[PDB]
From TrEMBL:
SS bonds (residue pairs): 2-14, 6-19, 10-18
Coiled-coil annotated residue ranges, if any: none
Organism: Hydra sp
Residues of the full protein shown: 32 to 52 of 149
Name the record gives this protein: Mini-collagen
TM segment ranges: none
Length: 21
């Protein structure tokens, strides 16, 4: 999972499209 940078329901990339809307 991410910790802080992304929603880790999108895991396990923690991805710039799930992170930054």
């Amino acid at each position: 999972p991410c910790g802080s940078y992304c929603p880790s329901v999108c895991a396990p990339a923690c991805a710039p499209v799930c992170c930054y809307p």
